[PDB]
């Protein structure tokens, strides 16, 4: 498969780091310069870094200057980023992306998410939204961290008219979300 | 520093009608070897950016004929034909003449007829009201277009800054919306007051609907 692969995304706390890795499979790794790119959560695209094909010509968006470091390993087929002192507008998905001959980025992974927060982990409480000829009923989701949590109805028989609402961030630092469905009365 | 200009931010495109979007830049990437450095790419829901257009007017792998790149120098288009519903997502411009800088994206989307919101309140828990918190939920059911209004009341007084609200993405079925808003209040504060209301205004309503509950009936 020609794929690229990040993990290492993770949580932690302003000032601590992280360390991500991008696993290429399927081409000459060697070859191709690589990109770190990120999308903070709801925002667009921004470029962070790039590496080229030898190591060589590395460069910086300038908020990450001196924080980020950006490396390879060719005979790994990986790429990295060493990200310290962390911030939490830092807090985005991160998308590794192989460069072309034309500079277009032909080719992006999945994406890591990366949380950066001085919450602590908590489990939600899960309260019922109750009905009062269609009716609505569905859970709340309140008060967890950190992202993500998943949501299902009837262990997953029950699909139609599901909508499952993005978690909202609240001042405590922890999320809520809603799931709802509507159904015949 | 090249400043990359998208326009619109959101374009509802009619399903088989044409789209055209905007992206200028505040200087010319026009290289001397005669290329563009300009690439476009779309962002599905939930899915990673794909190269849709490299070099200005250049297709990438897979592309279909439908989509087409045009300009130079600092004035560029992305032109499709006959939108559907799987064009649907974020397209974003890029330029990589210098350090690499990329629009803030344009959001297509599937226009419909509209549609007003089915609304529902709906009470805090006895669960929740143990625990010192009560969390009143309003929901906003299968609607078109997105823009729409909460306001919340309290014994007719109106609330500021103890709610949030989060929308659905467009619902690839029937191309609607949906909004869910909670109104935060103490347990304390909560059983001071008696009628709990949500005022919804949106295009498909010829005035504000209101749904609400007496706390304790």
């Known amino acids: 498969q020609v794929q690229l692969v990040e993990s290492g995304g993770g949580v932690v706390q302003p000032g601590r780091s992280l360390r991500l890795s991008c696993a290429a499979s399927?081409?000459?790794?060697?070859?191709?310069?690589m990109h770190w790119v990120r999308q903070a959560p709801g925002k667009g695209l921004e470029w962070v870094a790039v590496?080229?094909?030898?190591?060589?010509?590395?460069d910086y968006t300038d908020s990450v200057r001196g924080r980020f470091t950006i490396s390879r390993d060719n005979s790994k087929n990986t790429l990295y980023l060493q990200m310290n002192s962390l911030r939490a507008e830092d807090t985005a998905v991160y998308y590794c992306?192989?460069?072309?001959?034309?500079?277009?980025?032909?080719?992006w992974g999945q994406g890591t998410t990366v949380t950066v927060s001085s919450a602590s982990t908590k489990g939600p409480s899960v309260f019922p939204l109750a009905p009062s000829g269609t009716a609505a009923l569905g859970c709340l989701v309140k008060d967890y961290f950190p992202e993500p949590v998943t949501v299902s109805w009837n262990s997953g028989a029950l699909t139609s008219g599901v909508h499952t609402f993005p978690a909202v961030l609240q001042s405590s630092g922890l999320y809520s979300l809603s799931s709802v469905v509507t159904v015949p009365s | 520093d090249i400043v990359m200009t998208q326009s619109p931010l959101s374009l509802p495109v009619t399903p088989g009608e044409p789209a055209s979007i905007s992206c200028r830049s505040s200087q010319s990437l026009l290289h001397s070897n005669g290329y563009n450095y300009l690439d476009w790419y779309l962002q599905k829901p939930g899915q990673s950016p794909q190269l849709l257009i490299y070099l200005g007017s250049n297709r990438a792998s897979g592309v279909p004929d439908r989509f087409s790149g045009s300009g130079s120098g600092t004035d560029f288009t992305l032109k499709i034909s006959r939108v559907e519903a799987e064009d649907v997502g974020v397209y974003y411009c890029?330029?990589?003449?210098?350090?690499?800088?990329f629009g803030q994206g344009t959001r297509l989307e599937i226009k419909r007829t509209v549609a007003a919101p089915s609304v529902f309140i709906f009470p805090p828990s006895d669960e929740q009201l143990k625990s010192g918190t009560a969390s009143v939920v309003c929901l906003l059911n299968n609607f078109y277009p997105r823009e729409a209004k909460v306001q919340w009341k309290v014994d007719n007084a109106l609330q500021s800054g103890n709610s949030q609200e989060s929308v659905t993405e467009q619902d690839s079925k029937d191309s609607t919306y949906s909004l869910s808003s909670t109104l935060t209040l103490s347990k304390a504060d909560y059983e001071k007051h008696k009628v709990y209301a949500c005022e919804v205004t949106h295009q498909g309503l010829s005035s504000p609907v209101t749904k609400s509950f007496n706390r304790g009936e």
């Open positions: 992306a192989r460069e072309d001959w034309a500079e277009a980025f032909d080719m």
């Open positions: 590496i080229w094909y030898d190591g060589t010509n590395k």
């Open positions: 890029m330029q990589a003449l210098q350090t690499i800088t």
């Open positions: 399927g081409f000459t790794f060697s070859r191709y310069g």
